[PDB]
Amino acid sequence: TPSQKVLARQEKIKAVALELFLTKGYQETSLSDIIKLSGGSYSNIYDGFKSKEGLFFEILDDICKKHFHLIYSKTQEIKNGTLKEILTSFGLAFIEIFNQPEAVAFGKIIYSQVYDKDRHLANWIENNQQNFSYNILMGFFKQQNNSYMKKNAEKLAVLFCTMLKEPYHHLNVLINAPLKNKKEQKEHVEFVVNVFLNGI
Amino acid sequence: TPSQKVLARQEKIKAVALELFLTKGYQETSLSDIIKLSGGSYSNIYDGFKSKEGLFFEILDDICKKHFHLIYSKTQEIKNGTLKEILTSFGLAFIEIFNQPEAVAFGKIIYSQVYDKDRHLANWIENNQQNFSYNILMGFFKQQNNSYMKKNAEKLAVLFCTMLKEPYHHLNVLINAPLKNKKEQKEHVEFVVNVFLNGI
Numbered sequence A, B: 001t002p003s004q005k006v007l008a009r010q011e012k013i014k015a016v017a018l019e020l021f022l023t024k025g026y027q028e029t030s031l032s033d034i035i036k037l038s039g040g041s042y043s044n045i046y047d048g049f050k051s052k053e054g055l056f057f058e059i060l061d062d063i064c065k066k067h068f069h070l071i072y073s074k075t076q077e078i079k080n081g082t083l084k085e086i087l088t089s090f091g092l093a094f095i096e097i098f099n100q101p102e103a104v105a106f107g108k109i110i111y112s113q114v115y116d117k118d119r120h121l122a123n124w125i126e127n128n129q130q131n132f133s134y135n136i137l138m139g140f141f142k143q144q145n146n147s148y149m150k151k152n153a154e155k156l157a158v159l160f161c162t163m164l165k166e167p168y169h170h171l172n173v174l175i176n177a178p179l180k181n182k183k184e185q186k187e188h189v190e191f192v193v194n195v196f197l198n199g200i
């Protein structure tokens, strides 16, 4: 179908963009580099891919959606659902995702944009709030028959993700600190889940 | 004294460096810009100020020391010392420090260095571990007559600072999200202190 060829073309451009970002580097790579190796698979006209930044964020679109459904699945595998084991299932999947080299590579690209005057990032984050994983946790907190947990649901979701992610991701990104292996992941999630549920 | 003039000279160069960073911008500013308006108050020779990055991190040296002693004082004002009120005194001072425009401006400079091949940042962080504020909390946790708190002291210190700082600072820095006013600060610290001490 024409629509399928359209989508196949978009995917070729994104893969080319990503490959350049990884080999040549995000800052080194220009739009014309991407048009160049996309060939005539990109005709300058019909695109919403109007820039290097726009393409990066189209790639991020997909990755966010992919991570969301993966975390959601792992979490909804548990039907029984104590808060402790839902936290723990969310935690394990979330932290694993942040301990891949990819998470660091993308992290660096985003950090490097701190002085961008086009505000692609702010627009992206504001237009995609519903696609972030913390929403998954937020939904469970609501379901909890607890005054405190329903009313603070979003902030608790965000608190939990933060305790898991930081400052480890920040250090992976800024000074390329070592990732956590599987065991350390497990340990950190459990450590965090206890403090969160039961306090020190 | 010669030693006092030496120090006065160093301070002039740092103030010039900082002023440029704030008005012209960190990336826009070059070492020669700094030498330029430092005048002959900088003779190229005796300095350890061998670069724009080195100067930035000399400025950061002072700021870190200043924040450390300020938090330490506010914390040691309390002699009575329940864990709750020591956490709360550390929290209020810490979060206030991160909700100043300065914290954001410096944050952006650091983030922008993510692709620096000189690794000034990693060296700086590794050489100044003892000067970070989390050490203050770490010391209290040790003093607590608690097996769990003494053995995890550093990680608990780092956990607490993180729950306070993130992801708010990250968003101030990346997309210039609004700072918390005094009331929101107070609210967040208390919110966080409860979860930390007592769990949800």
Ligand SMILES: C[C@@H](CCC(=O)NCCS(=O)(=O)O)[C@H]1CC[C@H]2[C@@H]3[C@H](O)C[C@H]4C[C@@H](O)CC[C@]4(C)[C@H]3C[C@H](O)[C@]12C
Binding pocket: A060, A063, A064, A067, A097, A103, A104, A106, A107, A110, A125, A132, A158, B167, B170, B171, B174
């Ligand atoms: C800026 C970070 C803050 C997280 C967030 O957006 N929380 C919202 C809090 S709030 O209720 O609106 O206050 C997140 C948001 C989007 C994140 C990035 C997108 O997630 C990019 C991905 C790649 C993925 O595997 C997820 C991690 C990551 C490599 C992210 C790193 C980064 O620190 C970002 C920018």
Ligand SMILES: C[C@@H](CCC(=O)NCCS(=O)(=O)O)[C@H]1CC[C@H]2[C@@H]3[C@H](O)C[C@H]4C[C@@H](O)CC[C@]4(C)[C@H]3C[C@H](O)[C@]12C
Binding pocket: A167, A170, A171, A174, B060, B063, B064, B067, B097, B103, B104, B106, B107, B110, B125, B132, B158
């Ligand atoms: C990278 C951040 C992580 C904090 C940290 O170093 N924790 C150590 C954890 S661990 O036990 O070694 O694992 C911190 C460390 C030094 C921090 C920067 C220095 O603090 C620069 C200052 C300016 C000050 O007012 C403090 C905040 C800040 C504007 C910082 C922002 C930033 O996110 C940094 C880089």
